[PDB]
Design a binder for this molecule. Sequence first.
Ligand SMILES: [Ca+2]
Length: 357
Amino acid sequence: AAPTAYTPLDVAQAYQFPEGLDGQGQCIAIIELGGGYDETSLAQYFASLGVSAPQVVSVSVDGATNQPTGDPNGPDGEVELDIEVAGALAPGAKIAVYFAPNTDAGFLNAITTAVHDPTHKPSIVSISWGGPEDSWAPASIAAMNRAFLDAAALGVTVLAAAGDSGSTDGEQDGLYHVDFPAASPYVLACGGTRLVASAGRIERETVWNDGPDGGSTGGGVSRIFPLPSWQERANVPPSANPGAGSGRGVPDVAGNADPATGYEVVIDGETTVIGGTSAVAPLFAALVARINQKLGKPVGYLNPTLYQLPPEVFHDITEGNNDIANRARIYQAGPGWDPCTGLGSPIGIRLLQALLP
Ligand SMILES: [Ca+2]
């Protein structure tokens, strides 16, 4: 009903992030195709939450640099949300922000640069930018997909927001579309939910869907990537598009994204609320950072493992749909994996326990 908001620490608590871990010794890389961040907002923010501020550094890719536009409603919102959510939850981690031109090659080069960076050596890459997989040049999808495969082989986890325009992903050709890079099978695709939670329990968690005007989580079935072997037990449905082909199901996991139960953040000096799947990648990047710290070695590519874990590791979202285009309710949430929320929201301490040697 009435819109609410949480600080990142409140959501981490709801998802039971493992205590006593802050990401020390880990570096989280965050990809950005526009805007920038200002030290004032970040300082004010971390101080407001009582956490020691992580070191944040910028990396220039193809001439692009950290350049805030000063508009709290522009890309500075994406850049600062990413750093504030990931940094508030893995404050001991080092954060490296890679700025690149907003072009197909810039996005690709930012990924390859971050993944192979011998200076910052990130173990995790968080991405909150994208586009309909069918709207990208095929050559770019192939190049970026190979870059994520390379990251997997190197032990670097790559997480990406699934989109904020529902099952149609903003296209109006009357067909359903999943977003890229989330569609890549080598990426931990992050969907979005409406979360009602307090420190001790989750009262309700449903698919984020605020209609055409408020946005909804991306999710569906890839028309490009075949169904992965490790995802064959998830009961991914065939595509809802005529032809009903089989394909990689999106997302893999999901977390709070509804702006109506959004994140309180400080953008360009303004205290406000932001949501979108954009917040989920940084949120779980912080979770992985804590897990890597405890394990003493990076988890790297997690998809295959996550899909073989027991039900206790996730909170199953079973209600809602991510259709903001028509009344067909494509696609719908349900028991088990679904094309709106994947395996659901992770229960941190249980995921960590499941990964302990
Ligand atoms: Ca479900």
